[PDB]
Amino acid sequence: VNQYLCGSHLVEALYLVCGERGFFYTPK
Amino acid sequence: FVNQYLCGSHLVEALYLVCGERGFFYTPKT
Amino acid sequence: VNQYLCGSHLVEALYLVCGERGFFYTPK
Amino acid sequence: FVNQYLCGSHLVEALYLVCGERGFFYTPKT
Amino acid sequence: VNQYLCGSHLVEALYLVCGERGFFYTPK
Amino acid sequence: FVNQYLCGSHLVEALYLVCGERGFFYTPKT
Amino acid sequence: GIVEQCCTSICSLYQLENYCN
Amino acid sequence: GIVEQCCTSICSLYQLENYCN
Amino acid sequence: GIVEQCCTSICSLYQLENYCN
Amino acid sequence: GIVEQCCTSICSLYQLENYCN
Amino acid sequence: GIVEQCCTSICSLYQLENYCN
Amino acid sequence: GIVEQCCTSICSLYQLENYCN
Ligand SMILES: [Cl-]
Numbered sequence A, C, E: 001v002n003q004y005l006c007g008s009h010l011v012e013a014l015y016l017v018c019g020e021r022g023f024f025y026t027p028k
Numbered sequence B, D, F: 001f002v003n004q005y006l007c008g009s010h011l012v013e014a015l016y017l018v019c020g021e022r023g024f025f026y027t028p029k030t
Numbered sequence G, H, I, J, K, L: 001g002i003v004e005q006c007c008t009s010i011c012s013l014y015q016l017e018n019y020c021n
């Protein structure tokens, strides 16, 4: 549906649960 | 673009905004 | 579509890219 | 309403929330 | 429509307007 | 999960994220 | 609840204040 | 000044409403 | 306005910078 | 990817943790 | 106290789960 | 180091673009 709005929450949700491990963000 | 200290989820959201469809990497560890 | 949710991200995105210049926010 | 220091994007989002469809102005400069 | 995205803004909007009173958040 | 000080709306959004459909309570007062 | 009211139409601070403690 | 009123000093609902349009 | 342009399709920093002061 | 899984249905912390490093 | 446990002290996932319903 | 460049030091648009993919 609306990936740009969804993406912005995702990335906040990964920052919390990955912490010190970090992550990569690839919309593809 | 702003001239400030970007930390925690503010720094990630700045990344999300400026990298666009390239996406980005976030590796905070020392 | 859903301006209130969209609006909230916009205003965050203007605060970052306008910085010291600031902006006006008028939904009209 | 909260009783705290509002800064950066927290202050803008407070504005967005309290001005509603009036919209608002944000002029941070000294 | 999309409660998870909507929910995340709501809870931020309650934190601002309830302040010191706090709130309960029950999606039901 | 991150190892940091969670405050204001960052702490609420962490709650929102980790309690899922249970929902949660936020009672900040002393 | 607040989801079914504030996710469809928009709520104001005053409708929003109904959910506070 | 908004930063001055609400970021380095605290400001009530009535003081943030001065910045509405 | 910016709502009708940046809520439908996505805008970049450069389209976004049109709204600055 | 994570967009096509966590934007349609909701993901939990545990599905979400699949994307970490 | 939530502020006390997670804002002025640090708290793990298991400590934020005490505030769930 | 990203934290090092942008959190405890300040970094311009061109410096955050180094973290894009
Ligand atoms: Cl959203």
Ligand SMILES: [Zn+2]
Residues within 6 Å of the ligand: A005, A009, C005, C009, E005, E009
């Ligand atoms: Zn959103």
Ligand SMILES: [Zn+2]
Residues within 6 Å of the ligand: B010, D010, F010
């Ligand atoms: Zn913050």
